[PDB]
Amino acid sequence: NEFGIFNSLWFSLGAFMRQGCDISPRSLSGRIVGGVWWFFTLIIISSYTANLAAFLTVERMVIESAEDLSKQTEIAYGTLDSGSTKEFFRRSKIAV
Amino acid sequence: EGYCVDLAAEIAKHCGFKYKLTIVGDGKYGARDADTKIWNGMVGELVYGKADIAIAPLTITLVREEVIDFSKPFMSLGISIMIKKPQKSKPGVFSFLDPLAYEIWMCIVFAYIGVSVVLFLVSRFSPYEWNEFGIFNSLWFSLGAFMRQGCDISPRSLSGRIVGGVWWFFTLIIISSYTANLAAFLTVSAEDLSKQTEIAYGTLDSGSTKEFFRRSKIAVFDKMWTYMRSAEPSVFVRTTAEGVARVRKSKGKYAYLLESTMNEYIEQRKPCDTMKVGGNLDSKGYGIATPKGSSLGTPVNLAVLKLSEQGVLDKLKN
Amino acid sequence: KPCDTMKVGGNLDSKGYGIATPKGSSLGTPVNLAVLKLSEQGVLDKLKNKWWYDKGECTSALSLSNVAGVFYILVGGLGLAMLVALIE
Amino acid sequence: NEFGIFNSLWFSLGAFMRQGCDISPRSLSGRIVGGVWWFFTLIIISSYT
Amino acid sequence: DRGVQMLLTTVGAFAAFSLMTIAVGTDYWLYSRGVCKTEEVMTHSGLWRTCCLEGNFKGLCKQIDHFPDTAEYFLRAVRASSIFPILSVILLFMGGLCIAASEFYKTRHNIILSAGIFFVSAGLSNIIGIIVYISANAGSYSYGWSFYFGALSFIIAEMVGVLAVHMFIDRHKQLRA
C-alpha cells in the first residue's frame, strides 16, 4: 500500500502508459516526483501520437513533366544519336 | 465550326485547293451491306462520285482501304466503354472500424481472450496464494485497460504485473494508431461487363465498332456480339448523342461502346454525368479519305505529317 | 529484371512503328493488307502479350503487418509470465 | 459505494472525459452497460481529436 | 458440480485437438486468385498446398513455394515450417493425455495443473501462428473454413484450460479441509 521499490516501478510504468494507478504519492516529495513524471509522460505520448499521424498523413500524399526536366539543369538527359527522337527534338518548335 | 473544319482549312491551305463543307443526309459515317455490296454514308458518297474528300472523324479499317485511299492517322484512338458515373459514397454504419484492417480487429479480440486467461491462471493457480482476479474479473480488467479506462483492481503479483504491463503497452500502440489513422482519412473492365447481363450495352449501328465486334473471335467480344445480336430491344443506336442520352437516362443500367475521343469530350462537358471506364479494346486512328485515283491523296498525307511535326494537331486537340 | 528504372510523366509525342519498303515495291501493297489482317485477327496482340507480359518479372487502413511487432511482444510476455509463476 | 442515480451520473461523466473512476460496476449487467459506454467514449473522443 | 466438469473438459480437449488438426491438415485457409500448378483463377490455398478450382484443370494442385534482409528470411522460414500451428497441435495432444492420466495415478492433483498449462500454451501458440500466417500472406482475398477452425480451436482450448485450472484449485481446496 506504500511505495516500495516494486510498487514504485509499477506506479511509474502505469503512469507512462496513462493506465491509471492503484495508489499515488501522499508526501510533498513524492508528489513533486509524480508531477514531473506526469508532465514528461504527457509531452512524450502526445508527441508519439502526433508524429505517427504525420508519418501516415504525409505518405498518403506522394516533378513529373518535360518542362520540369528542361528547368532542371543538374539532371542530364540524352537520346539515341541517329533516331526519330533526335530528329523530333531537332525539328521541334515547342519551348521545352 | 469544329476540329475537322479547321483541319480541312489547313489541309486546303497546304494543298492550295478549295473546299465546300457538306453534311450527309443519312447522318452515318459509313458501312457496307455484305449482301447488297452497297456503301452508305460518306464511303458510299466518295465511292459513288457524290464527293471527293472526307475531312471527318472517319475510322480506318481493312474494308474501307480496299475501296478508298486513306491517309496517315491525324489522331489515335480506341474503342472504349461509357457508363453513368456512379454517385459518391456515404461513410457507412460501422465505418468507425475502418482505420484498422479486419485482421487487426480479429487479432485484438483473440489477444484479449488470451491476456485475460493468462492473468487468471497466474493470479490464482498456486495453492500458496489462496488476488481478486477470477476469470470474470480478469476479463473486466483487460477490457477496461484496452479502452484506456478505470481499473478498480490492479495485479499485485510479479507475474500478474508482467501481464499487465505488456497489455498496457499493446493498448497504447494500438489506440494511438487508431486515432492517428483516423486523421489520415479525415485529411486527404470489359470482362466485368460481359459477365453482367443485367447491364445493357450497345454500339452505333453503322461503324467500325459494330464491324469490329462482328468480325471478332475473342471470347469476351464474341459473347458481347451474341448478346447485342440477341438483346431485345435493339441496343444499337443511330447517332452518338442517342447513346449519350440513353446512358444519361437509364440510371446506370446502360453502357455505350464508342471511340475514346468522344468519351473524353463528353466527360469534360457538363452535365458531366457519365464516365469512361477500363481500357481500349482495340487501337486505331482517324484517317482522312479520298477516292481511288484522286490527286489529293498524295499531298494530304504530307499535309498531315507536316501538321503533326509542327504540333498544330496537339494545339487543336487542346 | 533487374527492374532498376522507371517511367515518368506521359508521352511527349504520338507515333507508330511502320513496316517500310522502297519506292515502287511489289511487297508494299501486300504488307499493308497483311498488317490489317493480323490486327483484325488479334495476332499482333498475342505477340505483344507473349514478348511483353509473359516476360513479366515486374489513405488506407493499417495492416497486421504494420503492428505485428506489438503482437509478438505481447505473446512473448504472456509466456515469460507463466514461466515466472510456475518457477515460484 | 454502489451506483445510485447520482453516483451513476458521475461514473458516466468521468468515463466520457477519460478521467478515471472511483467505483466500477461489479455485476454482469452493470459491466455490460459500462463496456458499451467505454467504447462509445473512445470512438467519440478520438474522433474529436 | 465436479464429475460433469471432468466430462466437459475431456470433451473440449478432444474437440480442440481435432479441430486444430483438421485445420492444419486441410488446405482451405485462403480463397486467393492466382496460378494453379505451373491464366489466373481462384484457389483454395492452405498451409502447405495452394490448390486450384474453377479452372481449365481445376483439382490439380501443388506445394506452395514458400521462398522466392535476415528479418524476411526468418519470417519466411517460420511460416514455411508451420512450427507454430504444429506446436499447437502437439501441446493440445499432451494436455489431453494429462487429463486422461488424471484418472489413473490419482491423488497427485498436480498433473491436472499441467494439463491446464498445456492448453493455455497451445492457445498462445495458435495465435502466434495466425499472426505469422497473415503477415506472410502480405508478401482481393478471403479466409476459408480452415482458418476459422483454427480460431475456434483457440477459443475452446482456452476455455478448457480455464476449467482445468478451476478444477486444480478445487482439488487443493478440498485437500486443505
Numbering used by the authors:
A (entry chain A): 569 to 630, 633 to 666
B (entry chain D): 422 to 551, 569 to 626, 635 to 764
C (entry chain A): 716 to 773, 784 to 813
D (entry chain C): 569 to 617
E (entry chain E): 5 to 42, 55 to 84, 92 to 162, 173 to 210
Which text from the study accompanies this structure?
These cation channels assemble in various combinations from four core subunits, GluA1–4, with each contributing unique gating kinetics, trafficking and subsynaptic localization. AMPARs exhibit a modular architecture with a two-layer extracellular region connected to the transmembrane ion channel (transmembrane domain, TMD). The ion channel is encircled by diverse auxiliary subunits, modulating receptor gating kinetics, pharmacology and ion flux, with the transmembrane AMPAR regulatory proteins (TARPs γ2, γ3, γ4, γ5, γ7, γ8) being the most abundant.
A GluA2 mutant (F231A) increasing NTD dynamics phenocopies this behaviour, and exhibits reduced synaptic responses, reflecting the anchoring function of the AMPAR NTD at the synapse. The Phe231 to alanine mutation, which destabilizes this interface, slowed desensitization recovery of GluA2(F231A), both in the absence and presence of TARPs (γ2 and γ3). Closer analysis of the three sets of desensitized structures reveals a gradual transition of the LBD tier into four-fold symmetry, which is greatest for GluA1 and smallest for the edited GluA2 mutant: GluA1 > GluA2(F231A)-Arg743 > GluA2(F231A)-Gly743.
